[PDB]
């Protein structure tokens, strides 16, 4: 059950691709849709980073029901790594690779259009290159560990070494860390290393507007076949050109273009997917003062979730009062949900589910 990733609340997803895939072009779509930096006064947003609102139909419905004075969405932070660099050739730098450690998952952008063109080759290139860098790390950690074990008897050291060795075999065997089968102990240790191939990926398959509109692309069967045989992560076709074109239109021209050409933007899905793939969810709070998405890592329990709003809610935690969105939609009001006896009252061990509408009781 425990999660491969940073124990942290400021997660982000990195853009990774071989050149001419449209890495900076995808970033430019994202930047165009990003939340202005002055809304994040605690932060400094480098020009290679962007933050986009996560769209959610449940959230919008709650806003229609409560018409609150404040509406606050969750966001996804996205990093274009290419912009920081610009290595000889045949892959990414070591420079590029050092900036990946700093992200929590990867939008792997693939080139699936013609004017050589082999997205499957490019998958293999990057995956080999990530594993090699992981092997380097783990070897160095092996070197340091046995130096220490020579002059110390710390039990920690044998355990890490025992794992590093398991991880080295797995990697040398051609397998990525995140697809290994690790016990809770191992994952605890792995999360201190933050290995590159430990990071989850969402494959973005870049193609012409034509291929994307007709939902048909020559490279995508092989790409798909490769991905099912390498962890089976989500694959999302998109067209940088179309999305760029659609993003520069006024809203009504955009809707016309979608109807006249029977085509739709996949950016909402890309954002939602990426936010989920890095193991984030959110729960809602909803009344007339405010409707809000309160993001948390998956498997967060109620009092930790309470804590993110106000520390008193965790220190004084009594219970979390929880409505499921489907029950509120169905029955039409909090009153009706209470009446029907589905306004649950959940304790310290309750794992917050994505979509939970919560009111915290404390002190």
UniProtKB/Swiss-Prot annotation:
Residues 11-258 form the OBG-type G domain. The keyword ATP-binding applies. PANTHER family: OBG GTPASE FAMILY, OBG-LIKE ATPASE 1. The keyword Cytoplasm applies. GO terms for biological process: negative regulation of defense response to bacterium; negative regulation of response to salt stress; response to salt stress. Its main location: membrane. GO terms for cellular component: cytoplasm; cytosol; plasma membrane. This is Obg-like ATPase 1. It comes from Oryza sativa subsp. japonica (Rice).
């Amino acid at each position: 059950r425990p999660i491969l990733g940073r124990f942290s609340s400021h997660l982000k997803i990195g853009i990774v691709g071989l050149p001419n895939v449209g890495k900076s072009t995808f970033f430019n779509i994202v930047t165009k849709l990003s939340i202005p930096a002055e809304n994040f006064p605690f932060c400094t947003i480098d020009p290679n980073e962007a933050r986009v609102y996560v769209p959610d139909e449940r959230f919008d419905w709650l806003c229609q029901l409560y018409k609150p004075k404040s509406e606050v969405s969750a966001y996804l932070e996205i990093n274009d790594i290419a912009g920081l660099v610009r290595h000889a050739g045949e892959g990414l730098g070591n420079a590029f690779l050092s900036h990946i450690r700093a992200v929590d998952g990867i939008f792997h952008v693939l080139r699936a259009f013609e004017d050589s063109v082999d997205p499957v080759r490019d998958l293999e290139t990057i995956g080999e290159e990530l594993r090699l860098k992981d092997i380097e790390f783990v070897q160095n950690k092996i070197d340091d560990l046995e130096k220490s074990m020579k002059r110390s008897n710390d039990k920690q050291l044998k355990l890490e070494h025992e794992l590093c060795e398991k991880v080295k075999a797995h990697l040398e065997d051609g397998k990525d860390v995140r697809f290994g089968d690790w016990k809770s102990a191992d994952i605890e240790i792995l999360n201190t290393f933050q290995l590159l191939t430990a990071k989850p990926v969402v494959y973005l398959v870049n193609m012409s507007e034509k291929d994307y509109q007709r939902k048909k692309n020559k490279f995508l069967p092989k790409i798909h076949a490769w991905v099912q045989e390498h962890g089976g992560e989500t694959i999302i076709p998109f067209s940088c050109a179309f999305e760029r074109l659609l993003a520069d239109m006024p809203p009504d021209e955009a809707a016309k273009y979608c109807a006249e050409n029977q085509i739709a933007s996949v950016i909402p899905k890309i954002i939602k997917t990426g936010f989920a793939a890095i193991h984030l969810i959110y729960f809602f709070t909803a009344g007339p003062d405010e409707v809000k998405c309160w993001q948390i890592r998956r498997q967060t329990k109620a009092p930790q979730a309470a804590g993110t709003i106000h520390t008193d809610f965790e220190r004084g935690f009594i219970c979390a009062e929880v409505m499921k969105f489907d029950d509120l939609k169905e029955l039409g009001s909090e009153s009706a949900v209470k009446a029907a006896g589905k306004y649950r009252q959940e304790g310290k061990t309750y794992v917050v589910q994505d979509g939970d509408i919560i009111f915290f009781k404390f002190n």
